[PDB]
Design a protein around this ligand. Sequence first.
Ligand SMILES: [Mg+2]
Ligand SMILES: [Mg+2]
Ligand SMILES: [Mg+2]
Ligand SMILES: [Mg+2]
Ligand SMILES: [Mg+2]
Ligand SMILES: [Mg+2]
Ligand SMILES: [Mg+2]
Ligand SMILES: [Mg+2]
Ligand SMILES: [Mg+2]
Ligand SMILES: [Mg+2]
Ligand SMILES: [Mg+2]
Ligand SMILES: [Mg+2]
Ligand SMILES: [Mg+2]
Ligand SMILES: [Mg+2]
Ligand SMILES: [Mg+2]
Ligand SMILES: [Mg+2]
Ligand SMILES: [Mg+2]
Lengths: 76, 185, 141, 124, 55
Amino acid sequence: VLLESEQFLTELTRLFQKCRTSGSVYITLKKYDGNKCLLRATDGKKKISTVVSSKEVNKFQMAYSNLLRANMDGLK
Amino acid sequence: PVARSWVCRKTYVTPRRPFEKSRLDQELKLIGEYGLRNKREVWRVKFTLAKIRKAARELLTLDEKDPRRLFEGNALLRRLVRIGVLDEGKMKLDYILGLKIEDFLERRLQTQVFKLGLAKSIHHARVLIRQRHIRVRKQVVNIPSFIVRLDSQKHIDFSLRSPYGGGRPGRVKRKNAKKGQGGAG
Amino acid sequence: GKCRGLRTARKLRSHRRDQKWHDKQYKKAHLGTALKANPFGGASHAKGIVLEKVGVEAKQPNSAIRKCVRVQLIKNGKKITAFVPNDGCLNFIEENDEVLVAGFGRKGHAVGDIPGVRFKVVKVANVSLLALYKGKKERPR
Amino acid sequence: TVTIRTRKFMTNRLLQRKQMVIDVLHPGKATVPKTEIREKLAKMYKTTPDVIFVFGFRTHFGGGKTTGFGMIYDSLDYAKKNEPKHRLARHGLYEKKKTSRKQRKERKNRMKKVRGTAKANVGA
Amino acid sequence: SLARVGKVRGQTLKVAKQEKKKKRTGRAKRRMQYNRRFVNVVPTFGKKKGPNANS
RNA sequence: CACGGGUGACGGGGAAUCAGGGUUCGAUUCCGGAGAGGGAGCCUGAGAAACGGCUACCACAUCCAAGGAAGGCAGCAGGCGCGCAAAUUACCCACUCCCGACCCGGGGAGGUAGUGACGAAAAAUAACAAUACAGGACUCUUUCGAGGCCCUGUAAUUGGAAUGAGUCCACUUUAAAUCCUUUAACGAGGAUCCAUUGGAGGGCAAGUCUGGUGCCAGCAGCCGCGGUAAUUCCAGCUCCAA
Ligand SMILES: [Mg+2]
Ligand SMILES: [Mg+2]
Ligand SMILES: [Mg+2]
Ligand SMILES: [Mg+2]
Ligand SMILES: [Mg+2]
Ligand SMILES: [Mg+2]
Ligand SMILES: [Mg+2]
Ligand SMILES: [Mg+2]
Ligand SMILES: [Mg+2]
Ligand SMILES: [Mg+2]
Ligand SMILES: [Mg+2]
Ligand SMILES: [Mg+2]
Ligand SMILES: [Mg+2]
Ligand SMILES: [Mg+2]
Ligand SMILES: [Mg+2]
Ligand SMILES: [Mg+2]
Ligand SMILES: [Mg+2]
């Protein structure tokens, strides 16, 4: 599902909040031409996708970094 | 702290009443007489006339045989003579107040090309100014608002890079010649 | 001037400084009570949340049902009966939406047929109601 | 049909050079290149074109006149003594390094962190 | 009641826009305005009709 | 008019509106003052109560092995929040100067580019010729009609003549580039390479035109319009303001 950059982050947060019990989180980053990068996320059931352009990487990467640091925790 | 000017000024001032019928009548007659583009072209010459008349009133409020008054009056008369609106025998600071927007619009390079007669119409002269066919003192003038000086009045002619003058023909003429030679063989 | 002495500057200045406050525009502009009563707080535009749509009955001779929106502001939280300007544009505004609220050109005063309405709506969810009326843009759904 | 005239001629013995404002008339063509400018100044002033450095052309409207500044050194050693390295690299006798400025700042801030002889060992 | 919103805007007849030759603009529009104001008409007796006057 | 209070008050040169007088603003590139989250103290040093210096407390926050360590973008970019409201995590010390042991090194000061309809200046979107027509100074004719030495406009009638906007080799520009100017070759007849923003009762320039609605929708900054022939709504056409 191709969404907005902010809607992608909200649905990605909802993917972790749904996978607080069981389920994998798949994040695929790749080059995109048709400068842009394709960033897609998959829990196994519902797929979301976005394309991040050059105009919004400073707005995107910092909130995405805080999202990952808040949502990923392994073993001590 | 950057190195730049920040100096600018509006050259036109809008009138106080927007829909005066006699004012629109006079401005529409001015545009239809001298080949203008909008009402801003009337209003900016009106505001330069307002500048000149305000300077003239400020000189007439000064006393006679004042050095600043004499210097500014002689300089303003020299400017009016060199733009060629006021005559060289008429030059006195009391005659500046009796000067008109029509005599200011007479010194337009569009109007001067129309009076010299190298162009057919006033708007056709403006087309020639836009399309860069005429020059003034070996310098191409692309803008019709060029205030032609009285000393530089006689140097108005066609430019060198011009098909109407001594130059290469235009795109339509080259395309028609190429199409004719291609049809002939 | 009434007292025309040579050195009555402080008398004229104190008398004019006392008598400026009886003007309606001067006192409203220089007291903070009108600025406190103003929901915008000295602002030209304001965003706010739609919560309900109200059909307001009209005043004397002209009798109709004007359309208003109970806008709850963000910068203060105050409630404004904002006016939907154009025809058939109440259907675009849904519940729980952010709308931009401006004045009506009488500087905070009720205008014409509508009692107790000072403000109106310009934009609806970052899409202008003028373009929604003309049909140029579409509401994002 | 290209004509070069000189204005404001000055002899800097304290810089060991000549200098003038160059006025180029070229009807019927575009702006002539700096190599042709150096060649025509060389055949004008009877010197080698290696010492003649010309820069800063501005073309007037209409298309028949440019204005540019140019200096004529005495020797290539004096030119390398007082001539800027960027205008030397315009012609190619000097070549500046390709070390980018942000990476040089990063290298300097990395050498600032480590104290001792290992400042050279931090870099690569 | 708020059930009658957009009533007349819904129930008016949708008339399609007529195709039209493009108008001259700017100095040419003002020149054509000057030509249709002054140099065409003649002084006539009685009250002069307006530009949009029709009967 | 002290003292006290408020300021949605850094002060000034200045900005806007302006007859003459005034009113409002000034955070904003220049001069001076204050400051680096809130205060307080100090070493060094000619010059600091300095925070891209430390020392303690409060608010906020990072790592940790739980013994401990480290922070101050009201700098340049950029981010969250707050919002009616505000730009690139670029290139370079080449122009300006500043500092150092100094001709050589450094400068997010500064310069140049990216966004940019805050604003200011100039300013494309057509012009000419030929047909039909509609008319104005002359001659002629009682009018009707006629000749063109002089004309002016209109009509998706036709015709070549001229140019950018774009495309794009090449110079020039510049620290290296970009843009401007120059310059080949392309490039326009609905020259579709199509200019919109508001209004048409009055103030206020501009339809008693047509269809629908029938005090409903709505228009209307003020007066007012709409209750089944709306010059005021909604659509078409026409016109007017820039
Ligand atoms: Mg205060
Ligand atoms: Mg200040
Ligand atoms: Mg403040
Ligand atoms: Mg300080
Ligand atoms: Mg301190
Ligand atoms: Mg400091
Ligand atoms: Mg800091
Ligand atoms: Mg803004
Ligand atoms: Mg430097
Ligand atoms: Mg240096
Ligand atoms: Mg700076
Ligand atoms: Mg266009
Ligand atoms: Mg209408
Ligand atoms: Mg009106
Ligand atoms: Mg009227
Ligand atoms: Mg009333
Ligand atoms: Mg009206």
